[PDB]
Amino acid sequence: YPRLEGIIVQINTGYVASANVIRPVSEKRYFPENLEQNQSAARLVSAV
Amino acid sequence: YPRLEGIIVQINTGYVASANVIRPVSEKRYFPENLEQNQSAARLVSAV
Amino acid sequence: IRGNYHKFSYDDPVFKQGYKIYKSDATLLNDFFTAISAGPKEQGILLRAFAYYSLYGNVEYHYVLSP
Structure with a gap:
């Protein structure tokens, strides 16, 4: 039964999701202030 | 009959078009991302 | 490009909408x-007209006259 990996990960996911260890947020900070709208870094912000 | 090249090309043209070897698409990628609009390359994008 | 034979007064809904993306915003400008x-x-x-329309003026204050 090679679906048993789907069981053991599902048990281990239930420990992580109950530990309240990582919570998302709706704010992006991939770039510092005034670098996204900079024309010189347009080749870099289109890859990130 | 020097029009005989017009037949032998047309036999060979009908072979290539029946092989489906090159199909033209309607997307142009002559330039990389955001060099098209970049002022210094205005002399280069007109030549291409 | 876009259908010339008369007055063609500056409204031009390609050109103003494309500039509001070009001036403030554009890395998206490949996409539209x-x-x-x-x-x-x-x-x-269009791009040569956008770069010359960056000396003057503002998108934030609208005004329209005709040539």
């Missing part, structure tokens, strides 16, 4: 050129 289906030549016309 194929929303025009602007060809590579047609793309070259």
